[PDB]
Structure 1
C-alpha cells in the first residue's frame, strides 16, 4: 500500500512509501545472485556516454528468468522478493524437479500459487505459453519479440500487453505505449499483468532519494555558458532559441526513429 509519511522533518514531509508486507524480509536466493558493478554511465572508452548516472546503492543482480522454458513441469511460488534492479517484484518459484528460478511476479500471484509454462498449460495468471495458444483479447506480459529469445515487452511494474488480433503466423499486440505491433505467433508470453502496479504512486520526497537511486543531478542548458550548451549565455535569464539537446538537435517534437528494418512490424505508431 501507499503510505504518506508524517512531516517530522522537511524532506520527509512529501514522502510517500509503497510498502508491500508480502515481500520476503530476508536475504535473497544466493545461487541466482551475481555481481553487478556500477558504470557511472561511462563506456569502454571511459567517457561519460549517458549523463546523470552515478553512485547509488550497491546492488546484486538477481538472475530473472525471462525465457521461461521449463515446459510441462509445474512450479509453485515460494515467495515474492524485492529486486533492486527493476520496478517489478520478482517471485522465487520451485519446480517439482527441485530447480528454483526467479520470475517477474504477476498481479495476483502470491506464495503457494502454482504456475506452468508450455503449450498445454492452463490459461491462468503466471502461466506461460505461445501467443498462438493464448486467446485473443487477453492481457499478457513478458512478451517475446523473437521466438526463443526471452521476454522483452511489458516487464515494468504495472505493464501488460493486449493481444488484439491473430492473423496467420503473426499476432498484433497493443503495446503499453499505444503502438500496435505485429509479432510472430510462436513467440512466448506470460498471462496477466506484471505485479507492482502502485510503484508509480511512490514519491521520492527529497534530493537524497534520487541520489540513492544512482541518479546524479541534471543541469539546465539555459543555466550554462554558450560554450557548454546551445542554450547557454544571456545576461540574466535569456532563451531566444528553439529547444535542443546538448548536441544541437531539436527536443520538443522532432521524431528520431530511423529503423527501416522493423518499420514493417509496426502496424500503428503511438499517439
Structure 2
C-alpha cells in the first residue's frame, strides 16, 4: 500500500510543522547565579500564539527583558522574583524546596535547570505535596504523583487562561484558525473512509474497520493505528 498519514508526519514537511517563525519565546525559567537577589517588573501582557494563553513580559534589574510563563493574577507593574530567597507569592520562582507544602505551582522543571517542563498549559497546575532532603512529591495535572528533585524550580500559582476549554468551537472555521497556529494537519479523514491502499481500516463496500481496533504495541509504524495497546475500551464495565 501507501504510507499512512501518521508516517507522512515524521518526515517533518511544511504541512506538518508548527509555525515556529511565528512563535514568540520558550518560557524557560531565567537562570540565577545564586543567593536569589533577582527581581523584575512586569512591563506588559501578551498573547502566546503557541499556547493560546497569555504570557508576561518582565524587565529584570540587570536589564534583561524576557517573556515569562505567566500564572493567573500577574498584572503590569507587579514585581516578580526568581531565586531561593524569593518571597512566596504568586508569580515567583523558587526551588520546590523553598515552596511550602500545599501550594499550587506551575512550569515545573523535570531536572534542575531545564527551565520548566510540567504544567504549562492553560489553567492547569501541579500541587506540591511532600517535602524532604531527597525528594519533593508533586501532583501533576494528570493526577499522577510525581517524584522530583527538590532542587527543581517552579512558579507559584496556576497557569493563566483557565477555562479556555469551557467554550465550544461551534464552527469548523474557528477550529481552523487555531489549528493554523499549531504543528497539526487538520481536518481529519477517518481511515475507515479511505481506500484499502491508504490505511488499515480502508476499503470495504461499507465503512467499518476490517479488524479489531486494538493494536499491539509492538505493531510496526504503518500498522499501529486505532486503539493503541488499549488496556480496555468502551465505557461499560
5+ unaligned residues in a row in structure 2: which ranges? Answer: 216-220, 232-237
Matched, 1:228 2:189: no
Q: How does 1:211-222 map to 2 (within 5 A)?
A: 211-212=176-177, 213-214=179-180, 215-222=185-192
RMSD of aligned alpha carbons:
2.9
Greater share of residues in helix? 2
DSSP 3-state at the match of 1:92: strand
**CA distance 1:234–1:119, shift in 2 (3 Å):** same
State the TM-score, normalizing by the size of structure 2.
Answer: 0.78
Take 2:146 and 2:157, find their aligned partners in 1: how far apart are those partners? 19
Residue by residue over 1:210-247, the C-alpha shift from the partner in whole angstroms, topping out at 9 and shown as x without a partner, is 33322421111111122221111221233352115783
Give the CA deviation at 1:248.
2.8
Matched, 1:63 2:25: yes
Matching residue of 2:222: 247
Take 1:154 and 1:55, find their aligned partners in 2: how far apart are those partners? 23
DSSP 3-state at the match of 1:222: helix
DSSP 3-state at the match of 2:48: coil
Equivalent position to 2:85, from 114, 120, 134: 120
Does the CA contact (< 8 Å) of 1:242 and 1:250 recur in 2?
Answer: no
State the TM-score, normalizing by the size of structure 1.
Answer: 0.69
Matched, 1:143 2:108: yes
Does the CA contact (< 8 Å) of 1:124 and 1:191 recur in 2?
Answer: yes
Matching residue of 1:77: 42
Equivalent position to 2:119, from 151, 154, 159: 154
5+ unaligned residues in a row in structure 1: which ranges? Answer: 1-40, 257-271
Matched, 1:99 2:61: no
**CA distance 1:235–1:106, shift in 2 (3 Å):** same
Q: How does 1:204-215 map to 2 (within 5 A)?
A: 204-212=169-177, 213-214=179-180, 215=185
**CA distance 1:205–1:241, shift in 2 (3 Å):** same
Take 2:63 and 2:24, find their aligned partners in 1: how far apart are those partners? 19
DSSP 3-state at the match of 1:132: helix
Give the CA deviation at 1:208.
2.8
Take 2:113 and 2:17, find their aligned partners in 1: how far apart are those partners? 35
Equivalent position to 1:172, from 137, 157, 161: 137
**CA distance 1:58–1:225, shift in 2 (3 Å):** same
